[PDB]
Design an enzyme around this catalytic site. Structure first.
Site, PDB file in Angstrom:
ATOM      1  N   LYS A 106       0.823  -1.207   0.000  1.00 52.92           N
ATOM      2  CA  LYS A 106       0.000   0.000   0.000  1.00 52.92           C
ATOM      3  C   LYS A 106       0.860   1.260   0.000  1.00 52.92           C
ATOM      4  O   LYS A 106       0.653   2.169  -0.812  1.00 52.92           O
ATOM      5  CB  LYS A 106      -0.937  -0.010   1.209  1.00 52.92           C
ATOM      6  CG  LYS A 106      -1.849  -1.227   1.272  1.00 52.92           C
ATOM      7  CD  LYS A 106      -2.813  -1.174   2.454  1.00 52.92           C
ATOM      8  CE  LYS A 106      -2.096  -1.312   3.791  1.00 52.92           C
ATOM      9  NZ  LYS A 106      -1.443  -2.643   3.955  1.00 52.92           N
TER      10      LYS A 106
ATOM     11  N   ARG B 213      -8.910   0.343   9.626  1.00 50.63           N
ATOM     12  CA  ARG B 213      -8.322  -0.956   9.898  1.00 50.63           C
ATOM     13  C   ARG B 213      -9.304  -1.919  10.539  1.00 50.63           C
ATOM     14  O   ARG B 213      -9.021  -3.119  10.603  1.00 50.63           O
ATOM     15  CB  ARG B 213      -7.116  -0.785  10.827  1.00 50.63           C
ATOM     16  CG  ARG B 213      -6.015  -1.788  10.622  1.00 50.63           C
ATOM     17  CD  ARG B 213      -4.795  -1.109  10.048  1.00 50.63           C
ATOM     18  NE  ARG B 213      -3.612  -1.924  10.249  1.00 50.63           N
ATOM     19  CZ  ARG B 213      -2.378  -1.519   9.995  1.00 50.63           C
ATOM     20  NH1 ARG B 213      -2.148  -0.303   9.517  1.00 50.63           N
ATOM     21  NH2 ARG B 213      -1.369  -2.341  10.223  1.00 50.63           N
TER      22      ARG B 213
ATOM     23  N   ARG C 214      12.610  -5.114   3.795  1.00 53.74           N
ATOM     24  CA  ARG C 214      12.124  -3.746   3.692  1.00 53.74           C
ATOM     25  C   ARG C 214      13.068  -2.761   4.369  1.00 53.74           C
ATOM     26  O   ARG C 214      13.568  -3.006   5.472  1.00 53.74           O
ATOM     27  CB  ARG C 214      10.733  -3.615   4.307  1.00 53.74           C
ATOM     28  CG  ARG C 214      10.287  -2.166   4.432  1.00 53.74           C
ATOM     29  CD  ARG C 214       8.810  -2.058   4.659  1.00 53.74           C
ATOM     30  NE  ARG C 214       8.420  -2.565   5.969  1.00 53.74           N
ATOM     31  CZ  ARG C 214       7.163  -2.744   6.341  1.00 53.74           C
ATOM     32  NH1 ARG C 214       6.182  -2.462   5.496  1.00 53.74           N
ATOM     33  NH2 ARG C 214       6.885  -3.215   7.549  1.00 53.74           N
TER      34      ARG C 214
ATOM     35  N   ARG D  93      12.463  -0.928  10.089  1.00 50.19           N
ATOM     36  CA  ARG D  93      11.459  -0.663  11.106  1.00 50.19           C
ATOM     37  C   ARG D  93      11.659  -1.589  12.300  1.00 50.19           C
ATOM     38  O   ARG D  93      12.098  -2.736  12.168  1.00 50.19           O
ATOM     39  CB  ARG D  93      10.050  -0.815  10.536  1.00 50.19           C
ATOM     40  CG  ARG D  93       9.434   0.510  10.104  1.00 50.19           C
ATOM     41  CD  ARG D  93       8.163   0.324   9.291  1.00 50.19           C
ATOM     42  NE  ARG D  93       7.231  -0.615   9.913  1.00 50.19           N
ATOM     43  CZ  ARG D  93       6.041  -0.933   9.411  1.00 50.19           C
ATOM     44  NH1 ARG D  93       5.624  -0.381   8.277  1.00 50.19           N
ATOM     45  NH2 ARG D  93       5.264  -1.805  10.044  1.00 50.19           N
TER      46      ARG D  93
ATOM     47  N   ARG E  46       0.947  -9.604  13.153  1.00 54.81           N
ATOM     48  CA  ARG E  46       0.166  -8.590  12.451  1.00 54.81           C
ATOM     49  C   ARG E  46      -0.727  -9.201  11.380  1.00 54.81           C
ATOM     50  O   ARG E  46      -1.819  -8.684  11.122  1.00 54.81           O
ATOM     51  CB  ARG E  46       1.091  -7.541  11.837  1.00 54.81           C
ATOM     52  CG  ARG E  46       1.881  -6.748  12.871  1.00 54.81           C
ATOM     53  CD  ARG E  46       2.290  -5.376  12.356  1.00 54.81           C
ATOM     54  NE  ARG E  46       3.283  -5.428  11.284  1.00 54.81           N
ATOM     55  CZ  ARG E  46       4.580  -5.634  11.480  1.00 54.81           C
ATOM     56  NH1 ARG E  46       5.050  -5.819  12.707  1.00 54.81           N
ATOM     57  NH2 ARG E  46       5.415  -5.651  10.451  1.00 54.81           N
TER      58      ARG E  46
HETATM   59  N1  LIG Z   1       4.816  -5.252  -6.146  1.00 54.82           N
HETATM   60  C1  LIG Z   1       5.767  -5.611  -5.270  1.00 54.82           C
HETATM   61  N2  LIG Z   1       6.575  -6.674  -5.459  1.00 54.82           N
HETATM   62  C2  LIG Z   1       7.524  -7.007  -4.562  1.00 54.82           C
HETATM   63  N3  LIG Z   1       7.736  -6.315  -3.427  1.00 54.82           N
HETATM   64  C3  LIG Z   1       6.985  -5.225  -3.131  1.00 54.82           C
HETATM   65  C4  LIG Z   1       5.936  -4.808  -4.058  1.00 54.82           C
HETATM   66  N4  LIG Z   1       5.344  -3.721  -3.545  1.00 54.82           N
HETATM   67  C5  LIG Z   1       5.960  -3.455  -2.368  1.00 54.82           C
HETATM   68  N5  LIG Z   1       6.938  -4.353  -2.128  1.00 54.82           N
HETATM   69  C6  LIG Z   1       7.832  -4.409  -0.951  1.00 54.82           C
HETATM   70  O1  LIG Z   1       7.137  -5.041   0.126  1.00 54.82           O
HETATM   71  C7  LIG Z   1       7.462  -4.395   1.354  1.00 54.82           C
HETATM   72  C8  LIG Z   1       6.199  -3.881   2.021  1.00 54.82           C
HETATM   73  O2  LIG Z   1       5.568  -2.920   1.174  1.00 54.82           O
HETATM   74  P1  LIG Z   1       4.743  -1.693   1.810  1.00 54.82           P
HETATM   75  O3  LIG Z   1       4.280  -0.798   0.691  1.00 54.82           O
HETATM   76  O4  LIG Z   1       5.534  -1.119   2.958  1.00 54.82           O
HETATM   77  O5  LIG Z   1       3.478  -2.505   2.401  1.00 54.82           O
HETATM   78  P2  LIG Z   1       2.254  -1.836   3.204  1.00 54.82           P
HETATM   79  O6  LIG Z   1       0.999  -2.285   2.498  1.00 54.82           O
HETATM   80  O7  LIG Z   1       2.509  -0.369   3.417  1.00 54.82           O
HETATM   81  O8  LIG Z   1       2.296  -2.673   4.580  1.00 54.82           O
HETATM   82  P3  LIG Z   1       2.867  -2.180   6.003  1.00 54.82           P
HETATM   83  O9  LIG Z   1       4.002  -3.095   6.396  1.00 54.82           O
HETATM   84  O10 LIG Z   1       3.079  -0.684   6.012  1.00 54.82           O
HETATM   85  O11 LIG Z   1       1.600  -2.538   6.926  1.00 54.82           O
HETATM   86  P4  LIG Z   1       1.683  -2.619   8.531  1.00 54.82           P
HETATM   87  O12 LIG Z   1       0.262  -2.723   9.024  1.00 54.82           O
HETATM   88  O13 LIG Z   1       2.690  -3.674   8.917  1.00 54.82           O
HETATM   89  O14 LIG Z   1       2.324  -1.185   8.877  1.00 54.82           O
HETATM   90  P5  LIG Z   1       1.542   0.163   9.265  1.00 54.82           P
HETATM   91  O15 LIG Z   1       2.618   1.222   9.277  1.00 54.82           O
HETATM   92  O16 LIG Z   1       0.318   0.336   8.401  1.00 54.82           O
HETATM   93  O17 LIG Z   1       1.078  -0.061  10.787  1.00 54.82           O
HETATM   94  C9  LIG Z   1       2.053  -0.439  11.752  1.00 54.82           C
HETATM   95  C10 LIG Z   1       1.410  -0.486  13.126  1.00 54.82           C
HETATM   96  O18 LIG Z   1       0.734   0.745  13.383  1.00 54.82           O
HETATM   97  C11 LIG Z   1      -0.511   0.513  14.039  1.00 54.82           C
HETATM   98  N6  LIG Z   1      -1.608   1.045  13.206  1.00 54.82           N
HETATM   99  C12 LIG Z   1      -1.459   1.688  12.033  1.00 54.82           C
HETATM  100  N7  LIG Z   1      -2.667   2.045  11.531  1.00 54.82           N
HETATM  101  C13 LIG Z   1      -3.602   1.626  12.399  1.00 54.82           C
HETATM  102  C14 LIG Z   1      -5.070   1.680  12.479  1.00 54.82           C
HETATM  103  N8  LIG Z   1      -5.771   2.277  11.497  1.00 54.82           N
HETATM  104  N9  LIG Z   1      -5.669   1.127  13.553  1.00 54.82           N
HETATM  105  C15 LIG Z   1      -4.962   0.534  14.535  1.00 54.82           C
HETATM  106  N10 LIG Z   1      -3.621   0.450  14.525  1.00 54.82           N
HETATM  107  C16 LIG Z   1      -2.902   0.973  13.505  1.00 54.82           C
HETATM  108  C17 LIG Z   1      -0.648  -0.988  14.178  1.00 54.82           C
HETATM  109  O19 LIG Z   1      -0.309  -1.346  15.512  1.00 54.82           O
HETATM  110  C18 LIG Z   1       0.363  -1.580  13.227  1.00 54.82           C
HETATM  111  O20 LIG Z   1       0.917  -2.813  13.702  1.00 54.82           O
HETATM  112  C19 LIG Z   1       8.395  -3.245   1.035  1.00 54.82           C
HETATM  113  O21 LIG Z   1       9.726  -3.616   1.394  1.00 54.82           O
HETATM  114  C20 LIG Z   1       8.271  -3.037  -0.456  1.00 54.82           C
HETATM  115  O22 LIG Z   1       9.495  -2.609  -1.053  1.00 54.82           O
HETATM  116 CO   LIG Z   2       2.828   0.864   5.008  1.00 52.06          CO
END
Ligand SMILES: Nc1ncnc2c1ncn2[C@@H]1O[C@H](COP(=O)(O)OP(=O)(O)OP(=O)(O)OP(=O)(O)OP(=O)(O)OC[C@H]2O[C@@H](n3cnc4c(N)ncnc43)[C@H](O)[C@@H]2O)[C@@H](O)[C@H]1O
Ligand SMILES: [Co+2]
Length: 214
Positions: free
Chosen positions: A13, A88, A123, A156, A167
């Site tokens: 995303k 979420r 990542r 991270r 997760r």
């Molecule tokens: N086409 C492709 N082919 C191959 N490789 C590819 C590719 N596209 C991308 N890639 C690679 O794949 C990897 C991942 O891509 P990336 O684009 O980083 O994936 P993403 O969809 O952004 O997934 P996240 O890891 O950011 O989700 P998350 O929930 O773990 O983290 P968040 O910060 O949202 O949340 C973290 C924490 O915050 C809290 N939080 C955040 N939002 C909320 C909410 N709304 N409610 C409650 N808690 C929340 C939670 O506790 C959560 O645990 C990268 O290395 C990239 O290079």
């Molecule tokens: Co993300």
């Protein structure tokens, strides 16, 4: 233009949000980035997420709803925005509906569970901007450096394999039901829903999304 990106942790995303932000000039609203920023800066609104994210658990709906409302009320969101990682849970989505925050597109990123772990371990992130890279599948132009600022990338803190798996369990339990939530919305004419194959290369996912957004 208002967009929601749905997908499992690591589905890409944040990667695709950058292209949408660049081309359509709308800000990315990533609750994950905002929470990590609040922890780092010790902001009263968000610093509480430190221990929760370290435990690989979801933050209370109440806190992230407040963060999003605060963020949406900024100048740069009157011309649309992209929601990344929010909503979420169903209460977070209901909270948007109650507040009249309609969206034009809901875009679901489909990625098999088995691919997530290997994506996260490779990542690398540029924390100030939320830009992300993968050493194998989407590397920066210069190893370990942000393409935009040239600053040294980091990993991270919550990216251990055990944490990723925790997760994913939460995603399937709490977040996957949003697929049906917004599929129902789209069938009622309230948004455009589209599913994309997130296993394709980054550039191809971008093209598939570009064909949807226009
Ligand atoms: N086409 C492709 N082919 C191959 N490789 C590819 C590719 N596209 C991308 N890639 C690679 O794949 C990897 C991942 O891509 P990336 O684009 O980083 O994936 P993403 O969809 O952004 O997934 P996240 O890891 O950011 O989700 P998350 O929930 O773990 O983290 P968040 O910060 O949202 O949340 C973290 C924490 O915050 C809290 N939080 C955040 N939002 C909320 C909410 N709304 N409610 C409650 N808690 C929340 C939670 O506790 C959560 O645990 C990268 O290395 C990239 O290079
Ligand atoms: Co993300």
């Amino acid at each position: 233009m208002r967009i929601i990106l749905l997908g499992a942790p690591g589905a890409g995303k944040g990667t695709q949000a950058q292209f949408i932000m660049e081309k359509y000039g709308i800000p990315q609203i990533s609750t994950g980035d905002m929470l990590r920023a609040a922890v780092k800066s010790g902001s009263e609104l968000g610093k509480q997420a430190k221990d929760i994210m370290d435990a690989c658990k979801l933050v209370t709906d109440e806190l992230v709803i407040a963060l999003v409302k605060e963020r949406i009320a900024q100048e740069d969101c009157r011309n649309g925005f992209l929601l990344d990682g929010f909503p979420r849970t169903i209460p977070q989505a209901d909270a948007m509906k109650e507040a009249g925050i309609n969206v034009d597109y809901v875009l679901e990123f489909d990625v098999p569970d088995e691919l997530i772990v290997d994506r996260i371990v490779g990542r690398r992130v540029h924390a100030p901007s939320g830009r992300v890279y993968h050493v194998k599948f989407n590397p920066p132009k210069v190893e370990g450096k942000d393409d935009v600022t040239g600053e040294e990338l980091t990993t991270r803190k919550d990216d251990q394999e055990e944490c990723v798996r925790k997760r994913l369990v939460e995603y399937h339990q709490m977040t996957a039901p949003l697929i049906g939530y917004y599929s129902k919305e789209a069938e009622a004419g309230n948004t455009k829903y589209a599913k994309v194959d997130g296993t394709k290369p980054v550039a191809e996912v971008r093209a598939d999304l570009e064909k949807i957004l226009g």
